[PDB]
Amino acid sequence: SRVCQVTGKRPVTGNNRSHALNATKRRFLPNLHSHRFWVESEKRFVTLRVSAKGMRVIDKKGIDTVLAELRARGEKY
Amino acid sequence: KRMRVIREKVDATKQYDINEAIALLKELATAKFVESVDVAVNLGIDARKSDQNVRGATVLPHGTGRSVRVAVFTQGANAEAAKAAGAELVGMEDLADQIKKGEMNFDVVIASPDAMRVVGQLGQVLGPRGLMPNPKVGTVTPNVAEAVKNAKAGQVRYRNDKNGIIHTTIGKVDFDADKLKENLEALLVALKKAKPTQAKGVYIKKVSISTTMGAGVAVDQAGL
Amino acid sequence: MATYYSNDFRAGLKIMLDGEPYAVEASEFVKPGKGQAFARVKLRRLLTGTRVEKTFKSTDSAEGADVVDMNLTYLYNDGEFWHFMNNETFEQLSADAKAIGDNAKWLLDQAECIVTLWNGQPISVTPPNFVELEIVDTDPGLKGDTAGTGGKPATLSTGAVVKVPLFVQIGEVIKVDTRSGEYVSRVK
Amino acid sequence: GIREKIKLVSSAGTGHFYTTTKNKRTKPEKLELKKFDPVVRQHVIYKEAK
RNA sequence: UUGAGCUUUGAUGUGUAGGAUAGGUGGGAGGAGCCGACCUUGAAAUACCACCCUUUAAUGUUUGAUGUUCUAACGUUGACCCGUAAUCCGGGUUGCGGACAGUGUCUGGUGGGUAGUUUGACUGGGGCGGUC
RNA sequence: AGCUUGACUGCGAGCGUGACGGCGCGAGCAGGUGCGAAAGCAGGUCAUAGUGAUCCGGUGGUUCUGAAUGGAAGGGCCAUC
């Protein structure tokens, strides 16, 4: 489904409030993007379904650091 | 030369305050004869929009007295009662022959709503690029013709329109009370903000500078 | 703020919708059996202004503003903008090139023309039935052969053009009409 | 419809004001009436405003 | 390549008519020089300079508008190799695209394709007309 | 026609009229003016039609409150749109 691999962002639901406060149940979809990362430790291509803020975690942390938390949750990569 | 020391004490980066540069206008100018003050104050008005015109008669709250020769167009007893207010040539269509000659002895035209058939039918083109005013917009034509020029011939300076942003007015004699003129410039703010034409743009007043005749440059502020 | 349903405005009552404000010229009324009544309101545009045709039902209303039409007096020209003058209150007014289109040639001075006043200041200017004008650019017309009707073109002092007969050549003031724009007579 | 309303601002130090109606398109000058003031307890001349 | 704005310095406004090589308006008696108001003028008469309209660049501009090129994101429902006895999918070179597209959030426009509802009362029936 | 702003602020015993919301008259008191020499009169126009309740929102004034305290915001009162 639409779940980020790093942060785990499943889509939340909310209201589409108009000018007259009319409620309509929409769904907030995350900004997902299938990106192929490079890992210095593995020396190969790693394709993860990260979100837009998931790459910002990889902006700070190492790419080898993020996949260590993927192993301790039963995630396939 | 005599046009270089003038450009020394003009600092456009330092917008001067009220009490600072207006009191020193006697030293910024090296004029020969007796001169006066001018006031240039802007109001944002587009050239192609007719609902932005700002006109009116400004009663000045003091300097000059009866100085401007103003004409009267009235009938009846008001043709002999407006003469006590200081006007010289008071009358009727005999004054329309002076309009046909193009006499620049008069500058302001004041009438009353019974001789409005004179200016509106004879002084059509020559009155207003003549720019002599006769408005109910302004107080040009009331029926109070006795008490018009007891203060309007003395101290009233008329607001005219321009195609741009500018509304230049006139300041008084240099040797007057300079503390009152800085409040006269402050009470031209309440007269120009008395009509907020309600379709004004971003600002009300952007640049307001009061020069004397041709030498001084005194950048004032719109807030203070 | 006024209200006018379709059983109210019938002739010469301005309506306002989105805009521009329109004018009713003539209308009929049908009240048919089984169904709601309506009215073939033949509206008239005011700004451009050609025509618009709507079939209003019993619903709904429309804002009626503004209506005001009155006699004015042209006296002034400067650059683009024009002005007028009253005779019942003596109030100034400003005109534009948008309000003068396909009419600015005929009105010259002190004409008894009418305008339509709506929210600052005009919409359009209607010239009077007869104005006096003068030709300045017209050839010294010979008789010619000529065996009939004609009739030479004349360039007018206002920038217009009319067809004049042979007896007027240079500096002859003439009165014409402003509905069609033809020669009728010469003032003497 | 025609006759709009005005606000008679007191020319004294108080913020008290009377209000009334004045037809602007007949007599366009201001009103300078002289009524009672319930704050200063004087007989101050009132001035026209909006 | 360029377009628009600014605190900047000045140049720049060639008719009718007045000797002409007049920027709009408010002032209007300033600079071995000599104009000027006054006046002949026209819809407006200048000097002296002001607040600015506009043509013109030098600049730190604020930055947008596109237009080529390059490849490493991304697309690849192009071939070829393998997982694989597999026109799914995945990996691999490579080819063509290329920072376009596509998707997500915010936002304007369109929107009976769809959904929730409203569509007054008196009345010698309801309607219609009329009234409140 | 002369002169002027009583078309003024705080009240108001009382009744009239309405289911009520409300409307209407009000002597006189207190402060403060106007006119008349003076007695007196004036809180609109000879009278009855010219107008709509609340909520919400805007302007001006008043420490009346103001989420610990000292302020302000926002509310309250009054004038009012």
Swiss-Prot record, chain A:
MF-aspect GO terms: rRNA binding; structural constituent of ribosome
Keyword Ribosomal protein assigned: yes
GO biological process: cytoplasmic translation; ribosomal large subunit assembly
One GO location term (cellular component): cytosol
Top-rank lineage group of the source organism: Bacteria
SUPFAM superfamilies recorded: L28p-like
Entry keyword Ribonucleoprotein: yes
Cysteines engaged in disulfide bonds, as pairs: none
Keyword annotations of the record: Ribonucleoprotein, Ribosomal protein, RNA-binding, rRNA-binding
InterPro entries per the UniProt record, alphabetical: Ribosomal_bL28, Ribosomal_bL28/bL31-like_sf, Ribosomal_bL28_bact-type, Ribosomal_bL28_sf
NCBIfam families: L28 (TIGR00009)
Family label: Belongs to the bacterial ribosomal protein bL28 family.
PANTHER family, A to Z: 39S RIBOSOMAL PROTEIN L28, MITOCHONDRIAL (PTHR13528), LARGE RIBOSOMAL SUBUNIT PROTEIN BL28M (PTHR13528:SF2)
UniProt subunit comment: Part of the 50S ribosomal subunit.
Name of the featured protein: Large ribosomal subunit protein bL28
Organism (species): Escherichia coli (strain K12)
Gene that encodes the chain: rpmB
Swiss-Prot record, chain B:
UniProt GO BP: cytoplasmic translation; negative regulation of translational initiation; ribosomal large subunit assembly
Record InterPro entries: Ribosom_uL1_bac-type (IPR005878), Ribosomal_uL1 (IPR002143), Ribosomal_uL1-like (IPR023674), Ribosomal_uL1/biogenesis (IPR028364), Ribosomal_uL1_3-a/b-sand (IPR016095), Ribosomal_uL1_CS (IPR023673)
GO molecular function: rRNA binding; structural constituent of ribosome; tRNA binding
GO CC annotation terms, alphabetical: cytoplasm; cytosol; cytosolic large ribosomal subunit
Residue positions, PTM N6-succinyllysine: 100, 149, 181, 192
Keywords: Repressor, Ribonucleoprotein, Ribosomal protein, RNA-binding, rRNA-binding, Translation regulation, tRNA-binding
Alphabetical list of SUPFAM superfamilies matching this protein: Ribosomal protein L1
Stated role: One of the primary rRNA binding proteins, it binds very close to the 3'-end of the 23S rRNA. Forms part of the L1 stalk. It is often not seen in high-resolution crystal structures, but can be seen in cryo_EM and 3D reconstruction models. These indicate that the distal end of the stalk moves by approximately 20 angstroms. This stalk movement is thought to be coupled to movement of deacylated tRNA into and out of the E site, and thus to participate in tRNA translocation. Contacts the P and E site tRNAs. Protein L1 is also a translational repressor protein, it controls the translation of the L11 operon by binding to its mRNA.
Name of this protein: Large ribosomal subunit protein uL1
Swiss-Prot record, chain C:
Keyword Protease in annotation: no
CDD domains: S1_EF-P_repeat_1, S1_EF-P_repeat_2
Disruption phenotype: Disruption of this gene leads to lethality or to a very slow growth phenotype. Required for the expression of poly-Pro-containing proteins.
Outcome of substituting residue 33 to K: No lysylation. Loss of in vivo EF-P function for cell growth
Residues annotated as transmembrane: none
Modified residues (N6-(3,6-diaminohexanoyl)-5-hydroxylysine): 34
Primary location recorded for the protein, binned into one broad class: cytoplasm
GO biological process per UniProt: negative regulation of translational frameshifting; peptide biosynthetic process; rescue of stalled ribosome; translational elongation
Outcome (variant: residue 34 to A): No lysylation and loss of EF-P activity. No facilitation of translation of poly-Pro stretches
Keyword field: Cytoplasm, Elongation factor, Hydroxylation, Protein biosynthesis
Pathway: Protein biosynthesis; polypeptide chain elongation
SMART domains according to UniProt: EFP, Elong-fact-P_C
Outcome of swapping residue 31 to A: No lysylation
PTM note: Is beta-lysylated on the epsilon-amino group of Lys-34 by the combined action of EpmA and EpmB, and then hydroxylated on the C5 position of the same residue by EpmC. Lysylation is critical for the stimulatory effect of EF-P on peptide-bond formation. The lysylation moiety would extend toward the peptidyltransferase center and stabilize the terminal 3-CCA end of the tRNA. The hydroxylation of the C5 position on Lys-34 would allow additional potential stabilizing hydrogen-bond interactions with the P-tRNA.
UniProt GO molecular function: ribosome binding; translation elongation factor activity
Subcellular location: Cytoplasm
Statement: the UniProt record of this protein carries the keyword Cytoplasm: yes
GO CC, any one term: cytoplasm
Name of the protein described by the UniProt record: Elongation factor P
Gene name per UniProt: efp
From Swiss-Prot, chain D:
Keywords: Methylation, Ribonucleoprotein, Ribosomal protein, RNA-binding, tRNA-binding
Domain of life per record: Bacteria
Gene3D superfamilies: Ribosomal protein L33 (2.20.28.120)
InterPro entries per UniProt: Ribosomal_bL33, Ribosomal_bL33_CS, Ribosomal_bL33_sf, Ribosomal_zn-bd
Cellular component, GO, one term: cytoplasm
MF GO annotations: structural constituent of ribosome; tRNA binding
Keyword RNA-binding attributed: yes
Pfam family, one: Ribosomal_L33
Membrane-spanning parts: none
One Gene Ontology term from the biological process aspect of the record: response to antibiotic
NCBIfam families noted in UniProt: PRK00595.1, rpmG_bact
Family: Belongs to the bacterial ribosomal protein bL33 family.
Subunit structure: Part of the 50S ribosomal subunit. Cross-links to the P and E site tRNAs.
Note: Surface exposed on the 50S subunit.
Protein name according to UniProt: Large ribosomal subunit protein bL33
Taxonomic lineage from the root: Bacteria, Pseudomonadati, Pseudomonadota, Gammaproteobacteria, Enterobacterales
